[PDB]
Amino acid sequence: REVISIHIGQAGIQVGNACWELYCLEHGIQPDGQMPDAFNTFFSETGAGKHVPRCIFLDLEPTVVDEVRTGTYRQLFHPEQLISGKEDAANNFARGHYTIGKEIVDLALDRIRKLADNCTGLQGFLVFNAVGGGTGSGLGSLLLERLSVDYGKKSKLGFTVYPSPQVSTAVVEPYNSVLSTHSLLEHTDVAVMLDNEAIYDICRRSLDIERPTYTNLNRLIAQVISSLTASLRFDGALNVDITEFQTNLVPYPRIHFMLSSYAPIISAEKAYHEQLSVAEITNAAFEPASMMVKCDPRHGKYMACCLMYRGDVVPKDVNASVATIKTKRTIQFVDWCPTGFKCGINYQPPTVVPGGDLAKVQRAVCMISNSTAIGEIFSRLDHKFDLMYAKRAFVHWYVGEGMEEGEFSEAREDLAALEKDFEEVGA
Amino acid sequence: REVISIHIGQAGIQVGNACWELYCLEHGIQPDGQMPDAFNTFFSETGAGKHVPRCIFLDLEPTVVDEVRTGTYRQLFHPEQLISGKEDAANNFARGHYTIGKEIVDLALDRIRKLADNCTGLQGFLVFNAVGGGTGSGLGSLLLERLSVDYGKKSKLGFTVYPSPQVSTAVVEPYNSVLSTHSLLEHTDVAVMLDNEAIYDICRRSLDIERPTYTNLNRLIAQVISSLTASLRFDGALNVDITEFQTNLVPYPRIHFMLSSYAPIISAEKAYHEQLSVAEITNAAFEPASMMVKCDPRHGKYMACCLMYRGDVVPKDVNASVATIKTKRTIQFVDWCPTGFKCGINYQPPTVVPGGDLAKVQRAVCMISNSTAIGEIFSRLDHKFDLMYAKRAFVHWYVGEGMEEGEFSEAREDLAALEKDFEEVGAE
Amino acid sequence: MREIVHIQGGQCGNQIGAKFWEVVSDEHGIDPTGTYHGDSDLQLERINVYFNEATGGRYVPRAILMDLEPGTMDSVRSGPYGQIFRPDNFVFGQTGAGNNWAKGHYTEGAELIDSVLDVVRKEAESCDCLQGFQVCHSLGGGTGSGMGTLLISKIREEYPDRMMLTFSVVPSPKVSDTVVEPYNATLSVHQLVENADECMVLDNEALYDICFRTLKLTTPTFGDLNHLISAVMSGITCCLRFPGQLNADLRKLAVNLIPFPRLHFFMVGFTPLTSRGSQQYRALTVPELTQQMWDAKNMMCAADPRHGRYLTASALFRGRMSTKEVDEQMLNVQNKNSSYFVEWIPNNVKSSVCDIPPKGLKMSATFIGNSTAIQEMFKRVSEQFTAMFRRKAFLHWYTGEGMDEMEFTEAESNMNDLVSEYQQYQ
Amino acid sequence: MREIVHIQGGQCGNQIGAKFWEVVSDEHGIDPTGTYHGDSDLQLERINVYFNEATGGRYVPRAILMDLEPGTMDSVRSGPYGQIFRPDNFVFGQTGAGNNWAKGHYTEGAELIDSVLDVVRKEAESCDCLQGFQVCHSLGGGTGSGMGTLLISKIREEYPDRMMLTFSVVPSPKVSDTVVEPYNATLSVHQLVENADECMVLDNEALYDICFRTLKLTTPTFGDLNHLISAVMSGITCCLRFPGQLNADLRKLAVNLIPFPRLHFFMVGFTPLTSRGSQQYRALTVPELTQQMWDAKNMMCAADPRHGRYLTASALFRGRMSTKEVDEQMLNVQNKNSSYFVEWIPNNVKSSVCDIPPKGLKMSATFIGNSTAIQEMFKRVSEQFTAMFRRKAFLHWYTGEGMDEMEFTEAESNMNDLVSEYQQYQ
Amino acid sequence: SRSYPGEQVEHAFNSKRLKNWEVPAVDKSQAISTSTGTRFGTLQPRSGRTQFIVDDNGHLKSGVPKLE
Amino acid sequence: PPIPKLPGYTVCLPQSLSDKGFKKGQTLTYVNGYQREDALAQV
Numbered sequence A: 001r002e003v004i005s006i007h008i009g010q011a012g013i014q015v016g017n018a019c020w021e022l023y024c025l026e027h028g029i030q031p032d033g034q035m036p037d038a039f040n041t042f043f044s045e046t047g048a049g050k051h052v053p054r055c056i057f058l059d060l061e062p063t064v065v066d067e068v069r070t071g072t073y074r075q076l077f078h079p080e081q082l083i084s085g086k087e088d089a090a091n092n093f094a095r096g097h098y099t100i101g102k103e104i105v106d107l108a109l110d111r112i113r114k115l116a117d118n119c120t121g122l123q124g125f126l127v128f129n130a131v132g133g134g135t136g137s138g139l140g141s142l143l144l145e146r147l148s149v150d151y152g153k154k155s156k157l158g159f160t161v162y163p164s165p166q167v168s169t170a171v172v173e174p175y176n177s178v179l180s181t182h183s184l185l186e187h188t189d190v191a192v193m194l195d196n197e198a199i200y201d202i203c204r205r206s207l208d209i210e211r212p213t214y215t216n217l218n219r220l221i222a223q224v225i226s227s228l229t230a231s232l233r234f235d236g237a238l239n240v241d242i243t244e245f246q247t248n249l250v251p252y253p254r255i256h257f258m259l260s261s262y263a264p265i266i267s268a269e270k271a272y273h274e275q276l277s278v279a280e281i282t283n284a285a286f287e288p289a290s291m292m293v294k295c296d297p298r299h300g301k302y303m304a305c306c307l308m309y310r311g312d313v314v315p316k317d318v319n320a321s322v323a324t325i326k327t328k329r330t331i332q333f334v335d336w337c338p339t340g341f342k343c344g345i346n347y348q349p350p351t352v353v354p355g356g357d358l359a360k361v362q363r364a365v366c367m368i369s370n371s372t373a374i375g376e377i378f379s380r381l382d383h384k385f386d387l388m389y390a391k392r393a394f395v396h397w398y399v400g401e402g403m404e405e406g407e408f409s410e411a412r413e414d415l416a417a418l419e420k421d422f423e424e425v426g427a
Numbered sequence B: 001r002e003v004i005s006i007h008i009g010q011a012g013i014q015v016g017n018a019c020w021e022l023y024c025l026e027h028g029i030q031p032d033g034q035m036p037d038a039f040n041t042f043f044s045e046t047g048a049g050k051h052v053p054r055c056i057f058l059d060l061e062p063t064v065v066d067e068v069r070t071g072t073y074r075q076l077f078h079p080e081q082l083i084s085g086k087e088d089a090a091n092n093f094a095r096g097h098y099t100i101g102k103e104i105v106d107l108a109l110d111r112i113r114k115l116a117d118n119c120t121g122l123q124g125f126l127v128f129n130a131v132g133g134g135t136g137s138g139l140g141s142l143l144l145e146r147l148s149v150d151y152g153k154k155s156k157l158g159f160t161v162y163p164s165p166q167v168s169t170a171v172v173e174p175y176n177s178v179l180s181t182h183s184l185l186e187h188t189d190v191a192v193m194l195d196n197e198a199i200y201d202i203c204r205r206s207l208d209i210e211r212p213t214y215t216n217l218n219r220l221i222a223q224v225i226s227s228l229t230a231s232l233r234f235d236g237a238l239n240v241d242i243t244e245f246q247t248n249l250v251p252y253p254r255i256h257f258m259l260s261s262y263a264p265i266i267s268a269e270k271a272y273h274e275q276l277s278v279a280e281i282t283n284a285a286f287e288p289a290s291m292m293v294k295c296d297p298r299h300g301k302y303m304a305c306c307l308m309y310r311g312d313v314v315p316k317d318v319n320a321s322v323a324t325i326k327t328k329r330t331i332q333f334v335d336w337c338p339t340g341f342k343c344g345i346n347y348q349p350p351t352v353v354p355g356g357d358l359a360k361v362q363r364a365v366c367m368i369s370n371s372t373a374i375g376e377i378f379s380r381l382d383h384k385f386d387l388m389y390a391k392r393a394f395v396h397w398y399v400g401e402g403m404e405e406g407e408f409s410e411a412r413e414d415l416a417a418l419e420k421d422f423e424e425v426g427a428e
Numbered sequence C, D: 001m002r003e004i005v006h007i008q009g010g011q012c013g014n015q016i017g018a019k020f021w022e023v024v025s026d027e028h029g030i031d032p033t034g035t036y037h038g039d040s041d042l043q044l045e046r047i048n049v050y051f052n053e054a055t056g057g058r059y060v061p062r063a064i065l066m067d068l069e070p071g072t073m074d075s076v077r078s079g080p081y082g083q084i085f086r087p088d089n090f091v092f093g094q095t096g097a098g099n100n101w102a103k104g105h106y107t108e109g110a111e112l113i114d115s116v117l118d119v120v121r122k123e124a125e126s127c128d129c130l131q132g133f134q135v136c137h138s139l140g141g142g143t144g145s146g147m148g149t150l151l152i153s154k155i156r157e158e159y160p161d162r163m164m165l166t167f168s169v170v171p172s173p174k175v176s177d178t179v180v181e182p183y184n185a186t187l188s189v190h191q192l193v194e195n196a197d198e199c200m201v202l203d204n205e206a207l208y209d210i211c212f213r214t215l216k217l218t219t220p221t222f223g224d225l226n227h228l229i230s231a232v233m234s235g236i237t238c239c240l241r242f243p244g245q246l247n248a249d250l251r252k253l254a255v256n257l258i259p260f261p262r263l264h265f266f267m268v269g270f271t272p273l274t275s276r277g278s279q280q281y282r283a284l285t286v287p288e289l290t291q292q293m294w295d296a297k298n299m300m301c302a303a304d305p306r307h308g309r310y311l312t313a314s315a316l317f318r319g320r321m322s323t324k325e326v327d328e329q330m331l332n333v334q335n336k337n338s339s340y341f342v343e344w345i346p347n348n349v350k351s352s353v354c355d356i357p358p359k360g361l362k363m364s365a366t367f368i369g370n371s372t373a374i375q376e377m378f379k380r381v382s383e384q385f386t387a388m389f390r391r392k393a394f395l396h397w398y399t400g401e402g403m404d405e406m407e408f409t410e411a412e413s414n415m416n417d418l419v420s421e422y423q424q425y426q
Numbered sequence E: 001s002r003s004y005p006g007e008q009v010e011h012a013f014n015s016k017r018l019k020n021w022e023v024p025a026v027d028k029s030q031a032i033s034t035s036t037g038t039r040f041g042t043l044q045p046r047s048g049r050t051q052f053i054v055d056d057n058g059h060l061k062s063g064v065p066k067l068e
Numbered sequence F: 001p002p003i004p005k006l007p008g009y010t011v012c013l014p015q016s017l018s019d020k021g022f023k024k025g026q027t028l029t030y031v032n033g034y035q036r037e038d039a040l041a042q043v
């Protein structure tokens, strides 16, 4: 049971840069690559006493890549697992989808093929990308398309980083995000959104870090990924694997967008101050003040929920909590699903990184739900795509790269059909 | 069995500071948070050797909340509960009920939500506020409205501080008090009045402090709250929970205003002077010179009375004293209420705070009664409200902050209807 | 053989029950840890009526503690003889009626009575032959009166052929604890007059006067009052647990006391009750017992019997006594005060003797007189009820719980025609 | 002689069976190394039913662990009694089901069930006289329900003459583990009513209720739930493994319990179950066992039998007991509750007694009641199924794998007319 | 979503017993249409096969009514 | 010191409050192959 994780772009390989540090720290692997068998889901054992990860960091700018090649983990990552182009994609979906992709993706998928051949019990792929960039969106979409034709039936857990409503580091990112979604619809099996604004909010509220950088964002995202892959790695009283979210959370082939959350995110002060039981952290996982995507699930109605648990949790209290949540009315489901939860329990508590800002808690919850507030997100995103495109702005760059103007029209109508989908499905 | 406390305003959280110091002293909890299971009704034992209270101090001006954050009890309270705004409501019901409340109250009640979720056997809520100020009146009322629509049938003890008749610190506080009472009518289950001039007279006469500060007032208020929750905390020969005042004191669904009193408030040398016994302290709990509300119940008719007793007291003598009170004709009960009393006895005597002014006593009484002197007070207040309202003084502030004149008119006429209600209830 | 299961409702009921089981436990010599430590054999054979041998000399009481708040249960569990009950027999709730009979009969009973019924039904089928149920509660509180009332109703619906005792304390205006006392008492009595077989009326005012005048105690705590009530209950069912020359079971006393099915409110006394200083100057003869037994200042109710007619009466004696002196005293007391007894019933006194006295005493007695002076107390409550109900004070609390006004009209009608029929037979 | 081949499907089945083989090995005195170490030679004479001697006192279980992911298998092999299973019996896939009944019945079963059949066949003709097969699995998951179901259908096609038990946990609405619970439960029940000989329903709510009301635990890990189910399974097969005064085999139980070929869904219980805080206050008598038996709080199913009528019932007693008390208790509980027992069947209770109690106890029992109140559970599942199927939620992960819609409609018709005939016989 | 009667455990699943302490959701509990009407009750039996309300990919057919 | 196997008698320590950790080992694994794969059970 091995899962390989691919990272596309500047954000993708920076999230993986923190994720793989967490993995080596959890399995006791030195940054050299050898211990001083649960690691087998992530690290292939080569020769005698040497563990080389199952990942591909791929990007177009060689800056952050060869920064990894020179940093602390020179020896850990395989020399050729890190794949790097020569010239950037420059926030340009078309440039990263037609010009540069046609030479980088065939080498990448050739590489990932022999990683799958080295693999034995492949569970699925999990991808890491931000749809704001041109690298993450353009050849990210091209790679997912050619992965779906290669394997198809294996799951592709996508943890994307969508642009925030107002906090933004780009201008054309609505164009990029829409054109990326238009392919992330029919390629990704399960797509989880992660907005940097909401993570800024959490870092301010709970961890009381007044000035966080991207590392704290990457660090707690790594905590989330570790918390939903812990069932594969460690044994639990009720474990739930990768290919489960495909069946429990996606009621329709084009409705797959999941609001992730986590609890307890807590500092070293409030942890010592508050009693952490299963009831309140199950409540705290549902309060929109602790979600990873800036939306208001109270404004919508849930479709299905999944609750990963870690640490010291006995089934009586998690089931009693699910009961309490069912009795409350501050949150309400759609009129379809009388069985709206998917419980999962793992024995191992979450680990801490020396230098991290999270305290060590005996238990944690990671909620991956589905609602219609995601339909609210796409409406806001489509409005600011509608503003810019009404005046034909920035279209010149994309047309020059090679996208025909129609791509724009059909991507806009594809989102329009997606709005109708959420509107009718929630009825 | 738990009960949680919310404090709205300057006076609110100062009284709460006194109360929580008292509770720590009563349960032997060192201020850093750990002892060197009765506490389970106020503190939740977190982890191993740590007790966090079931309370939230919420306030708009940051000064006093930051003072608490840097005071002695930095470790006791935990910094996620002390809700502090940036700028004050500034003696302005409108500013505290429409402008700033609508941003702060959601966080407040969403903290209350998870406090109650941690709770197990919730007896009720209790709110602490002075209605003269801006925040405690305005967003106090807002919080009570949304709390009642969130919970509905649970008891909410409101220990409010009304402005004294002749001694007063503010000017628009009549407007504030009227607009606060208009909602305190239909949202509070049981509302206890505490003026400051009566407490000043008590401290002058009995405890013979000629120059008291607010700590003494808040200290005896905390003594009163402790005396009426000691039945929940410690075992008594005849105990009484919080939900009982809900039943046994409010005859009609709009008449819930209770004169509180206490005895014996006696200094050390006078305690050396006088013998303390149930008969004379029960007598002492009934004169106007020992009530917390500056009114004369001689002019009123008692509707009901609740008598909490603490310490070395047996039921035979409380029976004797209640008997002799009912025989004496200086005070009279209303016609349609023949059984106007409710006794309650608790074993543990009231403690002392070191540096406090009250001496340790074998026994004490806390009376929560109901009369028509409050119907007198509300007319005395409506007078000086109509005074300023006839010329529309200070109304521009509220109208600019977001109300209109209809709300003033409806609050005024609501208090008029309440006056008529008191008249008809007193009428035999 | 014959079985009595015990039900305790509310705060007053639970503390009466705690002292009652303490009294019975050394009546039969068992220690507070639950093993036998007595000397005579006569204590062994008749603890099937109250206890169950569990494993290797463990006698647990046959009781069902029942209320809404743990304050009374923990007050019970703290003291000695508190660790003898089975924890499965403690039924408790997380709310509290708060002296709201509507809460104690419509909202909270609705989710607790199912489990209370399961535990009492288990404790009734665990034995072979029920003699009767025995409940101790108040008529002022909510969780005692209200739920105890609902439980009585459901039990009498289920087991109609078995006896049923209710030790209920009623209020007085001088001792007036709850403000809604008449609203609770009137509705509860309106239920007790169609469900309970007989009710033994107690009240605290008379108990205070007894510990004031007779016992000459300085500071009578509630423990001593609860000890008076328990000695009364012990005197009631001593004949079941101990052999006598003239036996008298509960059903035997019921048929002898109740001439008409609705006149079953008994006033109670107990003797000997003498001050420790005056124990030296007295003698111990049956005259010395009856002269104190028939005193109006020794009844445990606020109903002076010389204001009305004794309909029937009963006396339960304990100790090695001479029946000729017993019956002659009963005859003399009947012949002297001949106007206070009803005319159309000759020899109005049932009498019985048991051979085992309470430990430490030579002779004791228990009096259960069914007089018509009890309509004093029922009117004393009925006028207060209609006084409040003319102005509809405190009514919203009851109405909000789903109780209508016609329930109050029926309750007052039952109270009124009841005292009408006492006045008829007086 | 009579042989029971044990099959464990899926996560639930693998963990329950892990505790099951722990308890059975403890009863027969086999150490976790695999050697006999018991004391009484009663334990030798009946281990052919559950074990095979390999080499010199090396007894291996007659069990087949089947699933798709090694995760459950490695949790089994880690703990004690993990090194006793035969490595050839670990038939085993590699993909993973994913709560998809179609994946567990159409895509992966088609390449795994052949090897599973090879293993179970080899283990079938290894012994002489099959008594029957015994599968433990779940109804919510995919790899347990789907793969187990296809195995049941194939086995019943192969060996149709031998018995078959199915210990299956069922979903509840408030412990709603998977989201496609009705899509899996409805399809599996639709298969069990034409393939399984008799089914024993289990539910986690009834198990929690038992652990908190009777056991009164603080942290009921899944180890204890799986232990409860293990004690029930051991109490079922006890009569084969130890001699009794009245022997009751599996076929003997089936012919007494199943009046009609479709009414074979039993709700199970077990006694005695008491807290360690109240193990001092109780006694161990046949009436005390049977009172705990027929209590509604002691079923292991989320269906109150008081809402319907008992068709038939069975009681398997263990320990040195008196059959007069056995039959008298079953006769009394039948006459006293005349409404909950069906009218057109006299003597609705089959009873049996074995003379070997489980280790550490004096006397135990096992209740198997074929009630009619199980139709409320099937109502609960069918209603949820129609709620989702009306609007086609989650359907495509089934439709794309081969399934049609007619299987869902047929699953509905069989669930709906089955609850129709339960309601008819009620 | 709806919460169905458990008939054995609802005594333990009362919202007040689960430390909800607020006015609970009875929307979820009235949509059942049980026999008694309260949470203690028996459901109604259902017969037949359910036709398809929705079109493919979760879009309500034109004939059936919906909330706007 | 010997104790019965009956339900609820033994209360296990949580073992997660301590730093133990519960890595599970791949003792059952497939062998690299194409269409045909062989299961392998190890010690």
Ligand SMILES: Nc1nc2c(ncn2[C@@H]2O[C@H](COP(=O)(O)OP(=O)(O)OP(=O)(O)O)[C@@H](O)[C@H]2O)c(=O)[nH]1
Pocket: A008, A009, A010, A011, A012, A014, A015, A059, A060, A061, A088, A089, A090, A091, A092, A096, A130, A131, A132, A133, A134, A135, A136, A137, A161, A162, A163, A169, A170, A196, A214, A215, A217, A218
């Ligand atoms: N969460 C997170 N987002 C990041 C991080 N670094 C960059 N981003 C996001 O990156 C987005 C812009 O695209 P980038 O990831 O910088 O670039 P790219 O996807 O490699 O594409 P090109 O810039 O065209 O090469 C913004 O939305 C950023 O918030 C990081 O460490 N964490």
Ligand SMILES: Nc1nc2c(ncn2[C@@H]2O[C@H](COP(=O)(O)OP(=O)(O)OP(=O)(O)O)[C@@H](O)[C@H]2O)c(=O)[nH]1
Pocket: B008, B009, B010, B011, B012, B014, B015, B060, B061, B088, B089, B090, B091, B092, B130, B132, B133, B134, B135, B136, B137, B161, B163, B169, B170, B196, B214, B215, B217, B218
């Ligand atoms: N009993 C008592 N009353 C106080 C105390 N402090 C202030 N008050 C009363 O509070 C009333 C005015 O409200 P404040 O508490 O001063 O301030 P506020 O309620 O927060 O309102 P804002 O000034 O708008 O923030 C005055 O009538 C004071 O008498 C105190 O310590 N004890």
Ligand SMILES: Nc1nc2c(ncn2[C@@H]2O[C@H](COP(=O)(O)OP(=O)(O)O)[C@@H](O)[C@H]2O)c(=O)[nH]1
Pocket: B237, B238, C009, C010, C011, C012, C013, C015, C016, C067, C097, C098, C099, C138, C140, C141, C142, C143, C144, C145, C146, C169, C170, C171, C177, C178, C204, C222, C223, C225, C226, C229
């Ligand atoms: N004899 C006796 N009566 C008591 C005791 N405690 C309370 N009571 C009586 O109980 C009545 C109040 O009922 P209460 O205890 O509140 O009932 P509950 O609230 O329903 O449990 C008062 O009239 C008291 O006289 C006691 O210890 N002994």
Ligand SMILES: Nc1nc2c(ncn2[C@@H]2O[C@H](COP(=O)(O)OP(=O)(O)O)[C@@H](O)[C@H]2O)c(=O)[nH]1
Pocket: A237, A238, D009, D010, D011, D012, D013, D015, D016, D097, D099, D138, D139, D140, D141, D142, D143, D144, D145, D169, D171, D177, D178, D204, D222, D225, D226
């Ligand atoms: N009693 C018990 N039930 C379990 C255990 N593990 C899972 N379950 C139940 O199995 C149901 C879900 O079935 P699942 O585990 O997905 O079956 P599978 O995935 O096909 O093997 C849940 O309702 C759980 O209650 C266990 O160890 N003990």
Ligand SMILES: [Mg+2]
Pocket: A009, A010, A061, A133, A134, A135
């Ligand atoms: Mg980039």
Ligand SMILES: [Mg+2]
Pocket: B009, B010, B133, B134, B135
């Ligand atoms: Mg202020």
